[PDB]
Amino acid sequence: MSAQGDCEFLVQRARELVPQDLWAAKAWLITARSLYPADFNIQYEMYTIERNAERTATAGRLLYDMFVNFPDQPVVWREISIITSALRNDSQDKQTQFLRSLFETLPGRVQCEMLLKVTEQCFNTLERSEMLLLLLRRFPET
Amino acid sequence: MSDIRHSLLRRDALSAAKEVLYHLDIYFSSQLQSAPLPIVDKGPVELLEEFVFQVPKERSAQPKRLNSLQELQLLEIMCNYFQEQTKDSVRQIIFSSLFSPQGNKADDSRMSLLGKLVSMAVAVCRIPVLECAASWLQRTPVVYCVRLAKALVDDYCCLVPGSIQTLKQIFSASPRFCCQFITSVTALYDLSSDDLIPPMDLLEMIVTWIFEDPRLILITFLNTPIAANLPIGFLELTPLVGLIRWCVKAPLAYKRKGVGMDRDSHLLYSKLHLSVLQVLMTLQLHLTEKNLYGRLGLILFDHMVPLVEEINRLADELNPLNASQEIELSLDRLAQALQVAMASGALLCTRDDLRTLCSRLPHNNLLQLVIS
Amino acid sequence: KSHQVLAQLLDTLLAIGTKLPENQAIQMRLVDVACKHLTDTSHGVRNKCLQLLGNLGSLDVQKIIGDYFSDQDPRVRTAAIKAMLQLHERGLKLHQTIYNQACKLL
């Protein structure tokens, strides 16, 4: 009803049985009111971080809301940027292609928007140059 | 009409059905535009009974030709005519007598013929008949429609091995029929017998419905407001809570009082319940900003109370040790469905309706937490 | 440049790879460079490259080895078949498509 702590406890319990009881995961991550946004940190992110088709849409729409509410998750953008340099080889091998697809599964515009935060704080010369090149490629007049 | 039925019954070798269809189309040409809903006209009911059920306006009358092969040929010709009639009037007159009462002496044979003809028409890709089948339960009795649809589904899948894929393809091509079959599936999923437990083909059909029939459910919800405890049949395709409660409690209720089929399929039943819950949550998310109205909130119409009562009846005898997990899962699934439905904004009460309904629900930690 | 030295160096690379089977990245580098020198005109170089592909390989490699069932030099063909056999012995599940290729070689 309105017991936000009970909602968080139910979300945690559903996360505990997430590998088996997937119905409670959907019912808890999509449970409005109470500690809904508080529970949308590992429940929704689990679908977002999944290797299935969920990452195509959930990560490009639900992770953006979390980033707006709290922009503290830059690991995905950094990992994608690192994998991008090494993704130009072993195309015939299935593992390299799978890793490259997992890195690039997120939308290009969403990935650039998320990595703009790292770009502003890119103290490293190589990181700053890579960020500037990515910004120029995405938008030549930026 | 007795005279028209007798006149059209002659020449059963692919000519009687054509004449009957022509006469019915001539009679109901205005009816095709006035109100082409799934209703049975008493004028062409006798013709349909005579040319298909081998029974004229009198129940004890002489059958048309020798029946059997001649009756089969007439049924095939009538199905071909109705599918190509391009009007819902003829198909509705032919098929609607199966479950919607007609108040006729020969209404039982006419109903059997209409059920066979509707099954053929669905298999003969007669889109108007399948589309009107959704409207059939909107104002006619729902129990009879559910029974007829369940019988047709069982004939397609259980009796005919491998034809279930054709039924799923038709349901994809006729989403109105697929949505109308959700209530029939829920009625046939009481877990009181082995057939009540869905098979692998039934699971595939359910997956197909979850993928496609949800759009039909949303379209129906947009067509008319979501009413709470509608007249005799709404056919809203929202029996998710009852189906989930039955499927989760299948290895418990079935074992309490066949039992082995539901007990060994605990993983399959859980997967089907999870898929149904996911489909219901997706539908609720789609029908969340849409004008789905309040008042009712969760789609129960007292079916949640019947499911809770059914679970509680078996929850005291042999459930606490053998299948306590199944009962807990059923209660949690019902509460989760209620909460997710309230998450769409339809249920404008965090604990008012919950205290009104969920207070009498059985004991479950997950369900109690979800409710409160 | 020379073919004998190239074949002997491929033998050395095979020895190093067999000395470090738990190392993965090393074996991917080794199979890549074996594929690179797999088109040499010397049958010995192709033999050693196929031996590398047989002893070392992800478990694509079957197609690469399968391509050399039609090699003009018979001993390169034997080396390719032995490489596929050694891949199978290492635990790889060969494809049914190898059956028709082997049937021609009988």
Side-chain angles (χ1 to χ4, degrees), chain A residues 3 5 14 19 24-25 27 32 37-38 53 57 59-60 71 74 86 107-108 140, chain B residues 13 16-17 35-36 38 43-44 56 61 63 101 103 106 115 121 123 128 133-134 141 149 151 161-162 173 175 187 198-199 214 225 227-228 231 233 239 242 250-251 253 258 260 294 297 306 315 320 323 335 337 341 343 345-346 362, chain C:
Chain C
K1 311 300 189 205
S2 178
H3 295 325
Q4 305 178 111
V5 193
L6 185 56
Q8 197 62 76
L9 283 163
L10 284 167
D11 229 315
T12 288
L13 258 56
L14 176 56
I16 290 152
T18 321
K19 195 72 161 155
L20 295 175
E22 79 297 312
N23 258 266
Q24 193 240 326
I26 311 294
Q27 286 170 110
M28 322 333 276
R29 283 193 68 185
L30 281 152
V31 301
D32 288 358
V33 84
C35 285
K36 283 197 205 292
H37 284 268
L38 188 42
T39 72
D40 194 284
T41 61
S42 160
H43 69 80
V45 178
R46 295 205 293 281
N47 285 9
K48 303 313 300 199
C49 288
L50 284 161
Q51 284 177 25
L52 274 157
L53 293 174
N55 293 64
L56 318 174
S58 156
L59 78 171
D60 205 338
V61 65
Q62 312 181 37
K63 277 88 176 201
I64 293 153
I65 293 161
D67 287 7
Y68 287 90
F69 285 9
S70 317
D71 198 86
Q72 65 93 0
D73 216 308
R75 71 207 105 170
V76 176
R77 266 170 291 172
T78 62
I81 302 154
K82 294 247 190 55
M84 201 94 68
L85 287 163
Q86 205 289 348
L87 273 180
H88 164 247
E89 99 168 54
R90 279 174 74 232
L92 181 57
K93 193 213 293 177
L94 310 188
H95 310 136
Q96 205 191 117
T97 67
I98 313 300
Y99 169 83
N100 307 271
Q101 314 203 52
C103 169
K104 293 195 221 88
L105 300 166
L106 290 164

